[PDB]
Every structure is written in structure tokens, then in C-alpha cells.
Amino acid sequence: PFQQFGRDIVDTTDAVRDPQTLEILDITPCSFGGVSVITPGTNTSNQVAVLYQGVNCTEVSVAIHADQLTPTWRVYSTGSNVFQTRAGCLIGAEYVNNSYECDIPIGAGICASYQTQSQSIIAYTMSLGAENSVA
Amino acid sequence: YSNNSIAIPTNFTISVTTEILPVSMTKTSVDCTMYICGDSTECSNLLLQYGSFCTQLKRALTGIAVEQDKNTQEVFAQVKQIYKTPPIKYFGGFNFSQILPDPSKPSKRSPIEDLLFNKVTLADAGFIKQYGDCLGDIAARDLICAQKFNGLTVLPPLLTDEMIAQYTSALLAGTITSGWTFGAGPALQIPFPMQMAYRFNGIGVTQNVLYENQKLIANQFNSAIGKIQDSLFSTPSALGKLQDVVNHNAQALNTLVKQLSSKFGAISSVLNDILSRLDPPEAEVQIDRLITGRLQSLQTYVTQQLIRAAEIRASANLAATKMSECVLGQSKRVDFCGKGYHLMSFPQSAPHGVVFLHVTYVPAQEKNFTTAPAICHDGKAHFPREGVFVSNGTHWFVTQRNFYEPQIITTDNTFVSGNCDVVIGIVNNTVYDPLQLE
Amino acid sequence: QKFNGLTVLPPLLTDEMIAQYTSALLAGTITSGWTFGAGPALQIPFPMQMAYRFNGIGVTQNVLYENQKLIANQFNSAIGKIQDSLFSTPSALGKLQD
Amino acid sequence: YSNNSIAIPTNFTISVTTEILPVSMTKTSVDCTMYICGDSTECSNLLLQYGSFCTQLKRALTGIAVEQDKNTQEVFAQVKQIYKTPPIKYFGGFNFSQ
Amino acid sequence: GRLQSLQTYVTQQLIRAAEIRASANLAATKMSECVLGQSKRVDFCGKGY
Numbered sequence: 001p002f003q004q005f006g007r008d009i010v011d012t013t014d015a016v017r018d019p020q021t022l023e024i025l026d027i028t029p030c031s032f033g034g035v036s037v038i039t040p041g042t043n044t045s046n047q048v049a050v051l052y053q054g055v056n057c058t059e060v061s062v063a064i065h066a067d068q069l070t071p072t073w074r075v076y077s078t079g080s081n082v083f084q085t086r087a088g089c090l091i092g093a094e095y096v097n098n099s100y101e102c103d104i105p106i107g108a109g110i111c112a113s114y115q116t117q118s119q120s121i122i123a124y125t126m127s128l129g130a131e132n133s134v135a
Numbered sequence: 136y137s138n139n140s141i142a143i144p145t146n147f148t149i150s151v152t153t154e155i156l157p158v159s160m161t162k163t164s165v166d167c168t169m170y171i172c173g174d175s176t177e178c179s180n181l182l183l184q185y186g187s188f189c190t191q192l193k194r195a196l197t198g199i200a201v202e203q204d205k206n207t208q209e210v211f212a213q214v215k216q217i218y219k220t221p222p223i224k225y226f227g228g229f230n231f232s233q234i235l236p237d238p239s240k241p242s243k244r245s246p247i248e249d250l251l252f253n254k255v256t257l258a259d260a261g262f263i264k265q266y267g268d269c270l271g272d273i274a275a276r277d278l279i280c281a282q283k284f285n286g287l288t289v290l291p292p293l294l295t296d297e298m299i300a301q302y303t304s305a306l307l308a309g310t311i312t313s314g315w316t317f318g319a320g321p322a323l324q325i326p327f328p329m330q331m332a333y334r335f336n337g338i339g340v341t342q343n344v345l346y347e348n349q350k351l352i353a354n355q356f357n358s359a360i361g362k363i364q365d366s367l368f369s370t371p372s373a374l375g376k377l378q379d380v381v382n383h384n385a386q387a388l389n390t391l392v393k394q395l396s397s398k399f400g401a402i403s404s405v406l407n408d409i410l411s412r413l414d415p416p417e418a419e420v421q422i423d424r425l426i427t428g429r430l431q432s433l434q435t436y437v438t439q440q441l442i443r444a445a446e447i448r449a450s451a452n453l454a455a456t457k458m459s460e461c462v463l464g465q466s467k468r469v470d471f472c473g474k475g476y477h478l479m480s481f482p483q484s485a486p487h488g489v490v491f492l493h494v495t496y497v498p499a500q501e502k503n504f505t506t507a508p509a510i511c512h513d514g515k516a517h518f519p520r521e522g523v524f525v526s527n528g529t530h531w532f533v534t535q536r537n538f539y540e541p542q543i544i545t546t547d548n549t550f551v552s553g554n555c556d557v558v559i560g561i562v563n564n565t566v567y568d569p570l571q572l573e
Numbered sequence: 574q575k576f577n578g579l580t581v582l583p584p585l586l587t588d589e590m591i592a593q594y595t596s597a598l599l600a601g602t603i604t605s606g607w608t609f610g611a612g613p614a615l616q617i618p619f620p621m622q623m624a625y626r627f628n629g630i631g632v633t634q635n636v637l638y639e640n641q642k643l644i645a646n647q648f649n650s651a652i653g654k655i656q657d658s659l660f661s662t663p664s665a666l667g668k669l670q671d
Numbered sequence: 672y673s674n675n676s677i678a679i680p681t682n683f684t685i686s687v688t689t690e691i692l693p694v695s696m697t698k699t700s701v702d703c704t705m706y707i708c709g710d711s712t713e714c715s716n717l718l719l720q721y722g723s724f725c726t727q728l729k730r731a732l733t734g735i736a737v738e739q740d741k742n743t744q745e746v747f748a749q750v751k752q753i754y755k756t757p758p759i760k761y762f763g764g765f766n767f768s769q
Numbered sequence: 770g771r772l773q774s775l776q777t778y779v780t781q782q783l784i785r786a787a788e789i790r791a792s793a794n795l796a797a798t799k800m801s802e803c804v805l806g807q808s809k810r811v812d813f814c815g816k817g818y
């Protein structure tokens with residue numbers, strides 16, 4: 001009953017009690033993360049893929065719908081170019097189940113590369129090598 | 136020690152040691168503006184007066200992350216071809232299920248690797264997308280949610296835990312199937328008893344000793360593997376290096392967070408209250424003091440991370456060398472791969488590190504009988520081609536340097552070059568030959 | 574420095590114990606060759622240990638046993654020259670001094 | 672260099688060379704309190720306004736000190752047992768008194 | 770001023786400690802290789818064989 005504030009180990013405001021209804025509410029960062037632009041050589045093509053690091057990008061999609069994201073630019077999100085990885089989700093690059101060698105490392109065993117479909121950026125799980133069963 | 140006394144091990148033991156070596160740490164991508172000025176436009180404008188000052192920090196952190204990825208790649212992706220273990224597992228009676236992957240486990244990791252994973256607790260997972268459950272944490276939010284408030288990100292490693300386990304499994308299958316030939320060229324398969332015989336031959340012990348003791352060697356290896364598994368399970372902390380790395384990174388992040396709450400010699404440590412209770416023209420001094428303090432804290436964190444990254448890169452280079460030498464071969468260098476005469480080493484994936492199972496050949500119960508530098512048969516000095524001139528006590532013998540397998544002194548196992556009057560300690564004895572008898 | 578709070582802690586291994594460790598290493602390497610570095614210390618007479626080392630570097634044991642006295646004299650002369658060079662040289666320990 | 676000419680040494684010399692390597696340095700124990708505010712309660716109070724900085728400094732120095740101790744231990748304490756040279760020092764004509 | 774000086778000293782001490790740690794690792798490797806055994810690595814432990 002006497003507690004009004006709320007903190008944690010590193011001395012940051014975590015939860016707050018409602019001063020009007022005597023109820024509790026916890027506080028979370030809004031959408032903090034990091035934008036990394038995946039792109040092939042500009043002499044090859046101009047299409048790019050944007051990776052919003054470390055975010056459940058369904059919330060990124062709803063933020064784009066609300067038009068409240070900090071970056072002014074907006075990549076095309078046609079549904080196919082969304083792939084939720086463990087380092088956020090790639091927007092602008094589709095996912096192919098084929099496994100190739102890494103070209104542009106992303107994280108969590110995902111590498112994007114430019115390939116023919118007629119050119120687009122495709123994300124995939126990296127291939128460690130040609131499997132060779134020893135007799 | 137004596138003039139003519141030598142001790143030769145009549146027996147031997149196979150001891151498996153464990154080496155803990157960090158290869159990478161958590162990659163961080165701390166942002167300038169979010170940590171320095173919390174969503175304050177004029178504070179960011181004032182920070183812009185410092186020029187490209189925090190771009191150095193961002194570049195350093197990006198280089199650190201790239202260096203961690205390169206360290207992991209160098210340590211684990213030694214072989215560009217993934218080798219799969221044969222469906223059946225009878226390697227001359229040698230247990231390997233403990234170190235080989237277990238297909239029953241969902242992660243396809245060996246029991247040793249799973250014990251190592253469960254014995255290490257990661258403060259910041261990073262590759263979990265913690266957003267979504269940070270607000271549903273019910274209890275007090277952990278370090279991760281608070282870190283996500285002031286410009287702290289933990290990028291996931293390029294190689295997943297399962298991917299590193301797959302690389303380790305490929306290395307293990309290559310080693311136990313093709314010996315060390317897969318570390319130099321094509322994977323030339325060889326039966327495990329033959330590979331063990333050649334590893335024995337590489338440490339100055341003849342090939343026949345393994346085949347004569349094919350059992351009681353596999354049993355010793357299995358017992359050693361089980362003993363080290365139980366030792367790692369019940370030990371207080373045998374993963375001290377990896378635990379220290381994780382704790383250091385997490386606590387450096389914690390100190391970086393805590394430096395925000397410090398006033399840094401100003402009226403307050405909270406930017407919004409400062410700029411609200413004081414008009415910008417007067418509060419600029421407080422803003423500058425806060426910015427200098429926070430920038431100094433970020434500089435200290437970045438420099439500490441750079442030094443720790445240099446140390447981790449040195450450790451990862453050592454781990455890569457250890458892999459390329461002990462794993463893909465048999466290092467003759469002493470104490471590099473375990474204590475004793477090294478035979479093999481088995482990689483085991485660990486959280487932010489690598490684990491080496493150095494299988495070393497160690498001598499055992501020994502007796503000292505007698506030695507002589509040379510044997511004089513007929514006015515000539517005879518020296519052993521391999522080994523020493525041991526003596527039962529009455530009849531001399533030739534035997535291996537590291538195992539007591541006495542042999543009759545013929546003319547083929549010993550070479551003669553001398554005049555019987557130049558060697559200090561030559562002894563009276565008779566040597567036979569398969570030519571004069573017939 | 575001490576009065577300004579900038580004190581230095583003494584090492585856990587004192588100089589006497591470090592010298593004892595070096596003496597143990599020397600005794601092991603001169604009475605057991607490399608055996609004490611792998612497992613139990615196996616006694617080996619020093620001429621035979623030198624034969625082991627010669628065979629390791631790739632020359633036969635007879636080249637040692639035929640001129641063991643010459644090798645011992647060369648070893649003694651070399652160690653005496655090492656001591657004399659350490660005496661004469663002012664900055665032979667440049668790395669530690671630096 | 673010729674097509675069919677090889678040079679082989681008809682003799683040999685045993686030369687011992689000295690190699691010197693630092694193993695550890697002085698373990699410093701700098702403390703913030705005196706060094707920044709020598710006997711000044713107010714100065715210490717304003718030092719607390721800079722956050723957990725001197726805790727980091729003390730931790731780094733303690734890590735350096737234990738690193739020096741572990742460096743010495745790793746370099747020297749490579750043998751569990753302290754071997755002793757035999758009372759009579761005659762190693763086949765070799766001289767180890769130095 | 771004193772904080773900047775102390776941070777500079779601690780950073781330089783950390784760099785020197787890393788260098789000394791590398792040298793001590795090299796010394797331990799040399800001990801293990803050419804003291805507890807014979808090192809075939811030429812020009813590693815003394816010039817010559």
C-alpha cells in the first residue's frame with residue numbers, strides 16, 4: 001500500500017502504481033532497436049533490405065501502419081518480403097529454403113544474397129558445406 | 136637418478152583432460168544518441184557539437200562484433216565439408232556416444248555438450264526477441280528490458296548454438312572416421328583401431344602394443360570419458376573461463392546502465408526534469424556536464440570492451456590453433472594438448488567457447504632395473520636403433536623408450552658403430568644375429 | 574607513492590618459492606628428461622637423456638657417445654660464457670628492465 | 672649451389688643461448704579515495720556523484736593483480752612435485768653447478 | 770582531472786597487462802615445450818636444433 005514507484009536491479013523505472021485507481025502498471029521501452037540496411041554492390045543493383053534488429057516485427061508492421069516509426073523512409077512490405085529471424089525480421093528480402101554459402105551475414109544463421117528469381121535479395125539459412133558421409 | 140639406472144613404464148593409462156577456452160563474447164551495438172540523450176532533440180543537437188566522436192565508438196563496437204564472428208568461424212569452421220558419423224557405432228570397442236551427437240535430443244547435441252550448456256547461464260540471450268514478454272514479465276523486469284531502454288543491444292552470433300554443434304559434430308565424425316587425413320586433404324577413412332595404433336606410433340610407442348591391448352584400452356577410454364562427464368557435472372565450476380566472460384560482459388553492461396543514474400556533478404541525473412525545470416540557455420551547462428559524463432562512461436565501456444575483445448581474440452586464436460593441431464592431427468608439443476603424450480582431442484561446443492577433450496597417453500606403474508649406453512659383443516660398440524639397453528638383472532634386453540617390452544639383442548634391432556673403447560659405460564654382453572646361426 | 578594511496582601488492586609466489594619451482598624443473602629435466610613433464614618422473618642417466626635429445630633432433634646416439642667428453646666440455650664452456658656475458662652486458666635484461 | 676653438391680658438417684658445437692621473457696609486473700592497488708580526495712569528506716561526497724566508476728577501477732586493478740599471480744603460477748608451477756637433485760652432482764661429465 | 774588521469778593510467782595498465790599476459794603465455798608455452806620435452810619447432814627455443 002505504501003509503494004508508489006517501481007524499480008529493478010539497475011535502478012530504472014520498471015513499474016508504476018496508478019495514482020487514480022490504485023492499480024499497478026509496468027513500463028517497457030517502446031520499440032528501441034537498430035536498423036541495418038542489407039544491400040548488394042551499388043554497381044550491381046539498387047534494391048536494399050532493411051533489418052530492424054531485435055524486435056518482434058509484427059509490432060514493426062503495426063508501427064508502420066500507424067506511421068510512427070522514427071526512420072522517415074518506408075520500404076515496401078508486400079507480405080512476401082517479411083521473415084522473422086532472431087535478429088529482428090528482414091523487410092524487402094524473401095526467404096528461400098535453399099541453403100547456400102554465406103554472402104551477407106545477418107545473424108542467427110541467416111545470410112542474405114542477391115540471386116536470380118529477375119533479380120532480388122533472398123534470405124536463407126547458411127550452408128556450412130557439402131555434406132560428405134565417410135564410409 | 137643414478138649412473139646406470141633407468142625407469143621404464145611397464146604399464147600405461149589413458150587419461151582424458153578437459154580444456155576450457157572462450158572463443159567469443161556477446162556482440163554489442165550500443166547506440167550513441169539513445170544512451171547519451173534520452174529522446175531529447177536539443178540534447179542531441181548539443182551532442183552534435185562533439186563532432187564524429189561517438190562514430191568512433193559505433194565503429195569500434197561493429198568491428199568487435201565482426202571480430203567475434205570471425206573468431207567463431209576460425210575456431211569452428213575449420214573443415215568446409217560436413218562429415219556424418221556412420222549409422223552404426225562400433226569403433227573397435229571405443230565408446231563414443233557421450234561425445235557424438237544424440238539424435239533423440241531435439242537440439243542434436245551430445246550429452247557432454249548439453250551438460251556444458253546447462254552448466255552455463257546466459258545473462259542476455261539476445262536471440263529470443265525478448266520484446267513482447269518484457270511487458271508480460273509479471274515480476275520485476277530483468278536486465279534485458281532495462282538495457283533495451285538506454286541504447287544497448289546484443290546482436291545474436293552469426294553461428295547459432297545448433298550450427299556450432301553441427302560444426303563440432305562434423306569435426307568429430309571426420310576425426311573418428313578418417314583419423315587426421317581430413318585436416319590435410321580428402322577424408323581418407325581408416326578403422327579406429329588402426330588410427331589409434333598410428334597415434335600410438337606417433338608418440339614413440341610401437342604399433343603392436345595397442346593391438347595386444349585392444350581391450351583394457353577402450354575400457355580405459357570409456358572410464359575416462361565417464362569420469363570427466365561426472366566431474367564436469369558435479370564440479371563447482373569447471374567452466375570458469377566462459378562464466379567469467381559472460382559475467383564480465385553482463386556486469387559491464389550493468390555498470391553502463393548504472394552510470395545513467397549518476398548526476399556527474401550536476402543538479403540532477405534526469406534529462407527531462409533538468410530541461411523542464413531550467414530553460415535551455417541556462418540549463419545548457421547541466422546538459423553539457425551530463426553529456427561529458429555519459430560520453431566518458433561510454434568511452435570507458437568501449438575501451439574495456441576493446442581490451443576484452445583483444446583478450447578473447449587471443450584466446451580464440453589459441454583455440455583455433457589447438458583445434459587445428461590436436462583435433463586435426465597429433466601435436467608433438469608437450470602440454471599443448473592435455474598433460475602427457477597427446478593422442479587425440481574431441482571438440483565440444485560450449486556457450487561462447489569451445490571444450491577440448493584431450494585424450495593423452497600417460498605412463499603407469501614402472502620399475503627401474505639397469506641401463507647401459509652400449510653393448511660390446513666383439514670389439515665393437517652396439518647401440519639400439521630404437522629404445523634403450525635395459526637389463527632384467529642378469530640378461531640385457533632392448534625395449535621401447537616408453538613401454539617395457541623387452542626384446543633379445545639381435546643384429547637388426549641394434550646398429551653397430553664404434554670400437555668398444557670409446558663409450559663411457561659400455562657393458563659386456565652378447566648379441567645374436569639371424570645369419571650366423573644358419 | 575605509498576603516501577598518495579598508490580600502493581603495490583606483493584606477489585603471491587615469493588622469490589624463494591619461484592626459485593624453488595625453477596630448481597624442481599631443473600632437477601626434473603636433468604634427472605628424468607621429458608618423462609616428468611608427461612607422467613611419473615622416470616629416472617634416466619644424463620648421457621642417455623642427451624642421446625634421446627640427439628636422436629630427436631635427427632642424429633644418432635653414437636655421435637654423442639663417441640665424444641661425450643667433448644660435448645660435456647663444450648657444454649661447460651658455453652654455460653661459463655653465458656655467465657660471463659650476463660656479467661659483462663649492461664642491458665642483457667632489457668625486456669625485464671623495460 | 673650446384674646440381675650435385677651437398678654440404679654436410681663434419682663437426683658440431685653445443686651453444687646455449689639465453690632468452691628472457693617477462694612473466695608478470697607489479698600488482699598495483701590504487702584507491703580512489705585518497706588519490707582524488709585526500710582526507711576530504713565533501714570531495715568524497717561529490718566523487719560519489721560520478722557513479723560506480725571507482726568500483727570499476729578497483730575491480731580492474733584486482734583483475735590485473737590476480738592475472739599477474741596466475742601468470743606466474745602458469746609459467747612456473749608446471750610440476751605438482753618438487754623434484755630434488757641427487758646429492759652427488761655427476762651427470763656424465765656435464766656441469767650444472769651454474 | 771584526477772578521474773581522467775586515473776582512467777588513462779588504468780587503461781594503460783590494462784594494455785600493459787594484456788601484453789604481459791601474452792608474454793607469460795609465451796613463456797609458459799616455452800617451458801612446457803622446450804623444458805618438459807624437446808621442441809621440434811626450429812628457431813623457437815634457441816637458434817639451431
Ligand SMILES: *[C@@H]1O[C@H](CO)[C@@H](O[C@@H]2O[C@H](CO)[C@@H](O)[C@H](O)[C@@H]2O)[C@H](O)[C@H]1NC(C)=O
Nearest residue numbers: 145146147148149350351352354355499500
Ligand atoms: C595395467 O593397468 C591396467 C589398469 O590400469 C590393469 O588392468 C586391470 O587388471 C586387473 C586384473 O589384474 C582388473 O581386475 C582390472 O579391472 C583392470 O582391468 C592391467 O592389469 C595392468 N597390466 C600390467 C601388466 O600391470
Ligand SMILES: *[C@@H]1O[C@H](CO)[C@@H](O[C@@H]2O[C@H](CO)[C@@H](O)[C@H](O)[C@@H]2O)[C@H](O)[C@H]1NC(C)=O
Nearest residue numbers: 224225226228229230231232233246357361
Ligand atoms: C557407450 O557408453 C554408453 C554409456 O554412456 C552406453 O549406454 C549405456 O546403455 C546402458 C543400457 O545398455 C544404460 O544402462 C546406461 O545408462 C548407458 O546409457 C552404450 O551402450 C555404450 N556403447 C557401446 C557400443 O559400448
Ligand SMILES: *[C@@H]1O[C@H](CO)[C@@H](O[C@@H]2O[C@H](CO)[C@@H](O)[C@H](O)[C@@H]2O)[C@H](O)[C@H]1NC(C)=O
Nearest residue numbers: 504525526527528529530531532541542543
Ligand atoms: C632375465 O630375463 C629372463 C627373460 O628371458 C628371465 O628368464 C626367466 O627365468 C625364469 C626363472 O627365474 C624361468 O623360469 C623362465 O622360463 C624365464 O627363462 C629371468 O627371470 C631374468 N632374470 C632375472 C634375475 O630377473
Ligand SMILES: *[C@@H]1O[C@H](CO)[C@@H](O[C@@H]2O[C@H](CO)[C@@H](O)[C@H](O)[C@@H]2O)[C@H](O)[C@H]1NC(C)=O
Nearest residue numbers: 510511512513514515555560561562563564
Ligand atoms: C667386455 O668383454 C671384453 C672381452 O671380450 C673385455 O676385454 C678384456 O679387456 C681386458 C683389459 O681390460 C683384457 O685383459 C682381456 O683380455 C679382454 O680383452 C672388456 O674389458 C669387457 N668390458 C667390460 C666393460 O667389462
Ligand SMILES: *[C@@H]1O[C@H](CO)[C@@H](O[C@@H]2O[C@H](CO)[C@@H](O)[C@H](O)[C@@H]2O)[C@H](O)[C@H]1NC(C)=O
Nearest residue numbers: 640642643644646647680681682683684685
Ligand atoms: C670439433 O670441434 C671441437 C671444438 O669446437 C674440437 O675440439 C678441440 O680439440 C682440440 C684438440 O684436437 C683442442 O685443442 C680444442 O681446445 C678443442 O677442444 C674437435 O677437435 C673438433 N673435431 C673435429 C673432428 O674437427
Ligand SMILES: *[C@@H]1O[C@H](CO)[C@@H](O[C@@H]2O[C@H](CO)[C@@H](O)[C@H](O)[C@@H]2O)[C@H](O)[C@H]1NC(C)=O
Nearest residue numbers: 649652653656760761764765766767768769
Ligand atoms: C662445475 O663448474 C664450476 C664452475 O662454475 C666448478 O666450480 C669451480 O671450482 C673451482 C675449485 O675447484 C674454483 O676455483 C672455480 O672458481 C669454480 O668455482 C665446479 O668444480 C665444477 N664441478 C665439477 C664436478 O667439476
